[PDB]
Every structure is written in structure tokens, then in C-alpha cells.
Amino acid sequence: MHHHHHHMSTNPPPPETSNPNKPKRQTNQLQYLLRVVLKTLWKHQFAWPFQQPVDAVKLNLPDYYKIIKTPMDMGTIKKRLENNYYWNAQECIQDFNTMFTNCYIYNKPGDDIVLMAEALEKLFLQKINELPT
Ligand code: NA
Ligand code: NA
Ligand code: NA
């Protein structure tokens, strides 16, 4: 008997950051989402949990990907913006929304990580209220 000792927890593959068959565009709004919105959130005190795909193995969260089925993070968003992956600003905004919502689903009000997400979401909303064009 192996007693399943070899069945260790793993992370899923990360979201794609390039897809040659997906239509994309460089718009002023998308350039702004990278240069201003993402880059200022990236420098924030609370950016660190969100700068890369959730590493459920490192964080000892083996239930994370049992609960969260559409993972998203600012590292993925940053690469998508730099690689010119998006067609429009709303597609990128959707990824930010998924990132924040995933955090609120997996965690509970009052958790340190939720307070971090709440603060970043407030800055995000402030920065995207007005976009170029
Ligand atoms: Na671990
Ligand atoms: Na893009
Ligand atoms: Na703005």
C-alpha cells in the first residue's frame, strides 16, 4: 500500500498571459490601466498577496483551488497588459474585479487579507473613475 503519501498538494497552471489567436488592441485606456492604475496599486503596502498567482502550496491553503475556480492576480494582469493581451479596458477591469471577489469569497470580513483587498479596491475604484478618452 502507498497510503497516498505521494499525493501532495499542487497549484493549478496559472492563467494565460498570451494567446496569439485572441484579438487585442492597444488603447489609451489600456495603456493608462498599466502605467497608472496597476503600477500605483503595485507599489502599495498591501500589494504583496496579489502580485502573483495564489501559491496555495506555499501558503498551506490546500482548499483554495477547491473554492476558487477563476483565479486572478495583479501579476497576471500586469503581464497581460505588457503583452498586449486585452481588447479593451473593460476586459482588464473584469480581471481586477475577479481578483478582489475571489479574496472576499475565500476569506471572511475582518481577516487581514480582506482588509488589504478592501483598501486596494478603494484605490482601484478611485483610479478608474476617470480613464483617458
Ligand atoms: Na506548503
Ligand atoms: Na491589452
Ligand atoms: Na483615473
Swiss-Prot record:
Functional summary from the UniProt entry: Chromatin reader protein that recognizes and binds acetylated histones and plays a key role in transmission of epigenetic memory across cell divisions and transcription regulation. Remains associated with acetylated chromatin throughout the entire cell cycle and provides epigenetic memory for postmitotic G1 gene transcription by preserving acetylated chromatin status and maintaining high-order chromatin structure. During interphase, plays a key role in regulating the transcription of signal-inducible genes by associating with the P-TEFb complex and recruiting it to promoters.
Entry note about domains: The NET domain mediates interaction with a number of chromatin proteins involved in transcription regulation (NSD3, JMJD6, CHD4, GLTSCR1 and ATAD5). The C-terminal (CTD) region mediates interaction and recruitment of CDK9 and CCNT1 subunits of the P-TEFb complex. It is also required for maintenance of higher-order chromatin structure.
Assembly notes: Interacts with p53/TP53; the interaction is direct. Interacts (via CTD region) with CDK9 and CCNT1, acting as an associated component of P-TEFb complex. Interacts with RELA (when acetylated at 'Lys-310'). Interacts (via NET domain) with NSD3, CHD4, BICRA and ATAD5. The interaction with BICRA bridges BRD4 to the GBAF complex. Interacts (via NET domain) with JMJD6 (via JmjC and N-terminal domains); the interaction is stronger in presence of ssRNA and recruits JMJD6 on distal enhancers. Interacts with NSD3. Interacts with NIPBL. (Microbial infection) Interacts with bovine papillomavirus type 1 regulatory protein E2. This interactions may serve for the tethering of viral genomes to host mitotic chromosomes allowing successful partitioning of the viral genome during cell division.
Other notes: JQ1, a thieno-triazolo-1,4-diazepine derivative, and I-BET, a benzodiazepine derivative, have been tested on tumors with success. Treatment with GSK1210151A (I-BET151, a I-BET derivative) has strong effets on mixed lineage leukemia and promotes myeloid differentiation and leukemia stem-cell depletion.
Organism, as annotated: Homo sapiens (Human)
Description of post-translational modifications: Phosphorylation by CK2 disrupt the intramolecular binding between the bromo domain 2 and the NPS region and promotes binding between the NPS and the BID regions, leading to activate the protein and promote binding to acetylated histones. In absence of phosphorylation, BRD4 does not localize to p53/TP53 target gene promoters, phosphorylation promoting recruitment to p53/TP53 target promoters.
Disulfide bridges in this chain: none
Tissues where this protein is expressed: Ubiquitously expressed.
Annotated Bromo domain residues: 25-131
Subcellular location: Nucleus; Chromosome
Clinical condition linked: Cornelia de Lange syndrome 6: A form of Cornelia de Lange syndrome, a clinically heterogeneous developmental disorder associated with malformations affecting multiple systems. It is characterized by facial dysmorphisms, abnormal hands and feet, growth delay, cognitive retardation, hirsutism, gastroesophageal dysfunction and cardiac, ophthalmologic and genitourinary anomalies. CDLS6 inheritance is autosomal dominant. A chromosomal aberration involving BRD4 is found in a rare, aggressive, and lethal carcinoma arising in midline organs of young people. Translocation t(15;19)(q14;p13) with NUTM1 which produces a BRD4-NUTM1 fusion protein.
Chain's gene name: BRD4
Family according to the record: Belongs to the BET family.
Residues of the full protein shown: 42 to 166 of 1362
Cross-link type Glycyl lysine isopeptide (Lys-Gly) (interchain with G-Cter in SUMO2), residue numbers: 66
Acetylated histone binding (site feature) positions: 107
Protein name, entry field: Bromodomain-containing protein 4
Span of the signal peptide: none
